[PDB]
A paper describes a structure:
GuaB catalyzes the oxidation of the substrate inosine-5´-monophosphate (IMP) to xanthosine 5´-monophosphate (XMP) using NAD+ as a cofactor, and guanosine 5´-monophosphate (GMP) synthase converts XMP to guanosine 5'- monophosphate (GMP) to generate guanine nucleotides essential for cell growth and viability. Indeed, genetic studies have shown that de novo guanine biosynthesis is essential for growth and viability of bacteria both in vitro and in vivo (10–23). Similarly, the NAD+ binding region, also where our compounds bind, occurs at the junction between neighboring molecules with side chains from both protomers contributing to ligand binding interactions.
The novel S. aureus and E. coli structures crystallize with one molecule in the asymmetric unit (asu), yet re-create the common GuaB tetramer arrangement via the fourfold symmetry operator of their I4 space group. We observed a tight overlay of structures across the bacterial strains, highlighting common critical interactions required for potency. These inhibitors mimic the NADH/IMP cofactor interactions by forming strong π-π stacking interactions with IMP while also hydrogen bonding with the conserved glycine (Gly299Ab/302Sa/300Ec) which is one of the two hydrogen bond interactions observed with the NADH amide. The ligand linker segment induces a 90° bend, directing either the amide N-H of G2 and G1 or the imidazole of G8 to form an important hydrogen bond to the conserved glutamic acid (Glu416Ab/417Sa/415Ec) while directing the aryl tail group into a hydrophobic shelf region. Differences in the polarity of a particular key selectivity residue specifically (Ser250 in E. coli versus Ala252 in S. aureus and Ala249 in A. baumannii) was found to be critical for inhibitor interaction with GuaB which corroborates the observations of previous reports. The key residues (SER-440 and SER-250) in the binding site of GuaB E. coli contribute to a stable and extensive water network (more green and well-connected spheres) predicted by WaterMap analysis with the pseudo-apo crystal structures. To disrupt such water network, the compound needs to pay a larger desolvation penalty leading to poor potency, whereas the same compound binding to GuaB in S. aureus and A. baumannii does not need to pay for such penalty with a less favorable water network (more red and less connected spheres). Based on our analysis of the water networks present in these structures, we hypothesize that differences in the free energy of solvation of the binding site produce the observed difference in binding activity.
Author numbering:
A (entry chain A), B (entry chain A), C (entry chain A), D (entry chain A): 1 to 89, 215 to 395, 411 to 466
């Protein structure tokens, strides 16, 4: 008999249900606990990607109430410098930085803690790997107060493994990324709505938040990820092509573009077979207007669902399952 | 566990079942109770939109046996004048007018009642909001005999809330509109067939009719909405581009067009993020031929289902659920 | 609660299961009982349409082992002449002719019986209509030995109604036609695989065969309709554009075409709203090669399923349900 | 009632679940038992097709750790020569050869055994046919030690029939081929994921491996077929257009192509109606790079699922069912 664990749902499979409301979109509270000690003003994390987050983007997002994650596709010294630029800014801004879950990263982590990183991201393509769990147990034992986000997982067992290893927050997402080809290359993936709810259910009562990472295309996807139980979302494509993102603006035929590629793409990699594509994204302009539009969508959802806080959206809002016709 | 209330169906998910019939399409009775006191000759209401209903369209539809709803995107004096033009016509024509569910609308409602409005439409994007319920309770207490339609809702709880608040009829539709982007922007919506049946079930035995508002593309959709339990349907796109609708006819490249936009579009709005698009619809001609074609479709359905009246269609006709292949 | 009688399946929703076989495709017996007295060599009936069957096509199909149905879109005298041409041919060929189920058709039926019609087709768009049932009871009482096919129905109740009224065979199909718009216009229809199995189950033990009429696109659809329980299939589009079909061959831009339209199209009609489209079909050539190809497909199915006769295919062959991905 | 045996799933209907892993993709063991006596280094078999496998391709694939199957669309002497070329190469390479399951093939089989064939492929379009079963029982009685692969089947009953007839391995696949039209022509087919799991369940405890033949488009499909229980996969389109495949390279408009057609196509056939198409595939280059890419995908899956061997992937890895939206 075919070993089918369950049916799994993606963003497009569901819709949120309107409910009794005393919530006006302008009155909605978007603050969220990224960890027990770290509270963000908006539930937005920028992707730890070489075409998405460096100090400039991390500064703009922190100013909006979110948090950026400096990618690991650079030298230890460059990364420590990027973190220092964000920490020494003005309005006491928070920053995160990504590290590989393999051997020979103890030095990179040391430099990042010295530079004043608020949250270390152990950036793995498979968080349920034993090597990853051991490295986070080792980072936790060395730095007992350091806020650590571990990922990625897409199951209840994977979420429990990261929480037991010492993670302050667990990142969910195996295969949902806009630039991901893991589903086609390996045949592995878990539809994000189910992946998030499974991870959140596993971590209930622990106070360990879940980050929904990947596949957010519209502000409606943010709302769905949060009502599935995520405390925050991580976005790549949504912030790619913004003025603040790294890389130069290109001109194809009148229209402005920026590069956007998976960290598992042939380009980002230069041994594993690629699990990401290399693409051009239309220039989005200033990050501030993107955040205002996306958070506005979330605000209107909160009004329609009668959830005045991120915690209410996470625990009260209901879904309906829809067909391909829906 | 993911909080999935139920699976929800849209027009395309179902088909009506042919049954024993003594009904000829030409013998079918299309009359319906919009409220306990108001009976329409056809189950058609025109959308309270600035690109759909003003006095001219409200006059043509009333003549066909339906009812128009003058939009709120104008001055109190202009709206009172539009209603007066319809009431003082010839064959004792009925009219409705839309009002916002916010504060500072008591004056607009006063002018509309004075002008002779037959039915006041409390036009909300979220009828289950406390503010809306309170304003309709206040309008009901001030005007105890005034026919009031309240909306929009898409749940059993929402329908009961509007009926208890004093509504003479309840309007259903959260996200089904042809020009709606609420599903993408907020992630909120309820597939219309389920939304209608849920609202009708909640109001059974109260004599409060349900209006199916939004997503009607074909005459088959009208039949489906009515068999789901709606007493009448409200149409926007179906009447957009008619000669009687407001705005001027445009010429793009040989072909004639009219503007059609959501009331939550950037244009109609000029603070909330837009929940509607701005578009061009092909010129449809005289409203009379559109009504004849659409009601003819409904008539043939009544013949195929053996339902001689709107009430029989609402309570006897059965559906089959179909797949994406169907 | 939404009145959903059941889920209903179409051809594309299912696949036939390969089984143990001693059947070679060349050894397969395609003969079938159209009625208790009439046996066809192939399970093919041509559609009673003005762009499909007249004496020439009825002659070619009868020669292949099937039966044609002369359409009613002509004078009583022309129709009687068409039937005479087929009956007085060479190898003792069988013919059918279509009549409307309304009043003022007694005369048309009289002329057709005189001309030597083997099977009268009471051609209704809604066979479950009381008027239709009464007219077939009247034809049965007048002509007790005349083979009568009544249709169309798409339910168990509809099949029983036609069988009780006196039908020698029942025709199934409400909305499946390639040129049908009833599903969009009226919202009524039943996916054909379910419609056929329901009608066959209702008629079990009566010896009244079921004809699957409409939506056959490929030879695989013929096999599916028969395994659903149909004794034969009726085809319109599959035979449209053949040399033998009525009308002239048109030249658009190098390529040859023939007209194909629904009997409920604006053209065929020239009062009801249209339920059919008017189109051009590519010229198919001689009917003989079409039949050889389509019956060859059926033969290979019989080999794969191990069903040596039409009766075995109807009662032994199994299906699997597939998804949109399948 | 419609005779629906069950719902059946294809590759696109499912995804593999990530699990706890101590497996690095580079450490994964790809070896598999094609039969009790034959062990391959990679789970890849090339299709016995005239546009896919001849001695050159069979040599390249064997060198990669797989096995080729020389097609039967040639003379007995040519086929015996092709097998001799592979057997007499260098690093003791294994080869297979295809034979028809009809009468007058005893001579072809005799020549192939003499030439040193390691595995005889009884290549039938319907393995559950009595003729096929009898011919393999006869080959088994004549050659008691000869490794025989019999196919194709897509049911538990079909797998048991081939195993009881003497097959050393059973090949699964009715209708999944990229170039197959059997589903459209005959209406017969079984979605491959279900077909494989059903055949594997039927053969549990017998030590008779199952080959998943047809529809493999991506390396993710290989992983899915193996986790469904297949010990190996057979590929046609994946190896078509490689330098090693038969036929000449064509130039259409700057781009290089090779022919790829079904063995049931009009061309390969030159009596049955065609069940295959004739097409052009883009030139893929050297087989070595294709294998490296595809096996790399499989390796990454093994890392993500924590399955270090083909046997672990076959018996431990779990799936989730996904929607059309997934
Ligand atoms: C080549 C591939 N590159 C990346 C890079 C960044 C990623 N970031 C997030 C995610 C994925 C990513 C894949 C894939 C799964 O979904 C989330 C990768 O590392 N493959 C991989 C497979 C199996 C194992 Cl044991 N180890 C590694
Ligand atoms: C911007 C948006 N504009 C409109 C205007 C007309 C509408 N008319 C009907 C419907 C919708 C409409 C949206 C949306 C839901 O489906 C039916 C709107 O008002 N958003 C909104 C969201 C949450 C809350 Cl608490 N308050 C208001
Ligand atoms: C206009 C329409 N014209 C046709 C003509 C031929 C047909 N032939 C087969 C079928 C249909 C056909 C419709 C429609 C249903 O599916 C099978 C028709 O007569 N409508 C109709 C509707 C309700 C009632 Cl009481 N009476 C008649
Ligand atoms: C014409 C057709 N030609 C082929 C050739 C190679 C194939 N190879 C694999 C498969 C199929 C193939 C069909 C079809 C089923 O799926 C797998 C074929 O032989 N039809 C057929 C049908 C019924 C019976 Cl009793 N005998 C034979
Ligand atoms: O090459 C890759 N393959 C798979 N996932 C990737 C790759 N690069 C980044 N990701 C993931 O995709 C996310 C971005 O998803 P997006 O917001 O849908 O574009 C990142 O935060 C990572 O979790
Ligand atoms: O901007 C908008 N967003 C969402 N719904 C809207 C908007 N404007 C109007 N509507 C709804 O859409 C209906 C028209 O739907 P239609 O008939 O499908 O075009 C109206 O009667 C309103 O209920
Ligand atoms: O205008 C029409 N509307 C609906 N059904 C029609 C019409 N004309 C013919 N039909 C049906 O469609 C069948 C032909 O279906 P086809 O083989 O899919 O083209 C006929 O035999 C009739 O039952
Ligand atoms: O004409 C044909 N019809 C149906 N199946 C075929 C035909 N020729 C080959 N096959 C099957 O299709 C497989 C190739 O599938 P692919 O890898 O998806 O291209 C072969 O190994 C055969 O089992």
């Amino acid at each position: 008999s075919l070993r089918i664990a369950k049916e799994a749902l993606t963003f497009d499979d569901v819709l949120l249900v309107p409910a009794h409301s005393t919530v006006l979109p302008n009155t909605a509270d978007l603050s969220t606990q990224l960890t027990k000690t770290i509270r963000l003003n908006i539930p937005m994390l920028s992707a730890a990607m070489d075409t998405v987050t460096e100090a400039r983007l991390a500064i703009a997002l922190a100013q909006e109430g979110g948090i950026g994650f400096i990618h690991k596709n650079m030298s230890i010294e460059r990364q420590a410098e990027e973190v220092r630029r964000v920490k020494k800014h003005s309005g006491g801004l928070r920053v995160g930085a990504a590290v590989g879950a393999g051997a020979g990263n103890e030095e990179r982590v040391d430099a990042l803690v010295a530079a004043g990183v608020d949250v270390l991201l152990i950036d793995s393509s498979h968080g349920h790997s034993e090597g990853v769990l051991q490295r986070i147990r080792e980072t936790r034992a060395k730095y007992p107060d350091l806020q650590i986000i571990g990922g990625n997982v897409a199951t209840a067992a994977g979420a429990r493994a990261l929480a037991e290893a010492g993670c302050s927050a667990v990142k969910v997402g195996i295969g949902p990324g806009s630039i991901c080809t893991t589903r086609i290359v390996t045949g592995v993936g878990v539809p994000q709505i189910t992946a998030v709810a499974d991870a959140v259910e596993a971590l209930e009562g622990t106070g360990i938040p879940v980050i929904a990472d990947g596949g957010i295309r519209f502000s409606g996807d943010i709302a769905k990820a949060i009502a599935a139980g995520a405390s925050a979302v991580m976005v790549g494509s949504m912030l790619a092509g913004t003025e603040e993102s790294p890389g130069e603006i290109e001109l194809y035929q009148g229209r402005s573009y920026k590069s956007y590629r998976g960290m598992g793409s042939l380009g980002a990699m230069s041994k594993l077979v690629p699990e990401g594509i290399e693409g051009r994204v239309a220039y989005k302009g200033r990050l501030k207007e993107i955040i205002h539009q996306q958070m506005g969508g979330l605000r209107s959802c909160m009004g329609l669902t009668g959830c005045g806080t991120i915690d209410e959206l996470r625990t009260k809002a209901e879904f309906v399952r829809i067909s391909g016709a829906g």
